[PDB]
């Protein structure tokens, strides 16, 4: 018959080698597909949905308290919160971006943060939300934070602010795993003014933090997560 030559790799098993194969059930007729709502085509359709960030993951915060960021009266210029911007082992670890990014090695594109105020309708505050690009430290003072990318958020009828964190990397892709070379920098929030509640009242009010991907979001090279312990 036709002369052939076998090449290296003959009879190997390869996890990702898409090939044809014989059917075990030669004339089987599959069950018809009825219309089902919520069809998913791409993981990046999911990455764009907002989920909560456990920003208050401090010790002694067992329960839903991890998703509540406290604000207090008469405090000004102080830091509300801050964190190192990882999509791996940071505060974003358990968010959907976290969970999706843990299945990929390379991350690129813009992130979206969003905060929602849940205090009294009669209360008010202005908050500064800022992003500090790679190479910088801290910030430790508002005077430093204000030099990065930032938004000043006025509490009012519209209860949610959206901060789109631009892609500022000089490297086309960054790692999902923590890696000094591709650090994404920091996120922080400061009291622009102060929290003001009605006269003679004293309360702590909270914000809820959210995260989602921007349309310009890229993921490459799939890998197993570290969320499985057996």
């Amino acid at each position: 018959g036709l002369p052939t030559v076998l090449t290296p790799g003959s009879e190997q098993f390869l996890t990702t080698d898409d090939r044809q194969s014989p059917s075990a059930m030669p004339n089987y007729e599959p069950t018809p597909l009825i219309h089902i709502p919520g069809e998913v085509k791409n993981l990046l359709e999911i990455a764009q949905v907002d989920t909560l960030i456990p920003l208050n993951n401090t010790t002694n915060t067992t329960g839903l308290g991890m998703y509540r960021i406290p604000l207090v009266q008469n405090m000004q210029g102080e830091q509300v919160f801050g964190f190192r911007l990882y999509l791996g082992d940071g505060v974003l670890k358990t968010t959907l971006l976290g969970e999706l990014c843990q299945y990929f090695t390379h991350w690129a594109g813009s992130l979206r943060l969003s905060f929602m105020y849940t205090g009294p309708a009669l209360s008010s505050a202005k908050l500064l939300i800022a992003y500090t690009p790679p190479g910088a430290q801290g910030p430790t003072k508002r005077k430093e934070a204000m030099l990065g990318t930032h938004v000043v958020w006025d509490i009012g009828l519209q209860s949610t602010v959206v901060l789109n964190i631009p892609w500022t990397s000089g490297v086309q892709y960054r790692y999902t795993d923590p890696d000094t070379y591709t650090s994404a920098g920091f996120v922080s929030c400061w009291y622009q003014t102060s929290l003001v509640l009605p006269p003679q009242t004293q309360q702590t009010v909270y914000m809820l933090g959210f995260i989602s991907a921007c349309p310009d979001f890229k993921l490459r090279l799939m890998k197993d997560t570290q969320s499985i312990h057996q």
């Binding site: 898409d18 090939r19 044809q20 014989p22 059917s23 085509k41 999911i46 009828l157």
Partner: protein
């Protein structure tokens, strides 16, 4: 070229499709526009 006439035997062929995140990101009766109040 397909070598088997039983369709399950076909390799993982397919096209990429345009994404449609609106099903998960904007499932609202009344259309919201960027820049418009969310709370009218």
């Amino acid at each position: 070229i397909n070598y088997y006439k039983d369709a399950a035997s076909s390799s993982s062929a397919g096209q990429s499709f345009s994404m449609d995140p609106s099903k998960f990101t904007e499932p609202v009766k009344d259309i919201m526009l960027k820049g418009a109040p969310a709370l009218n």
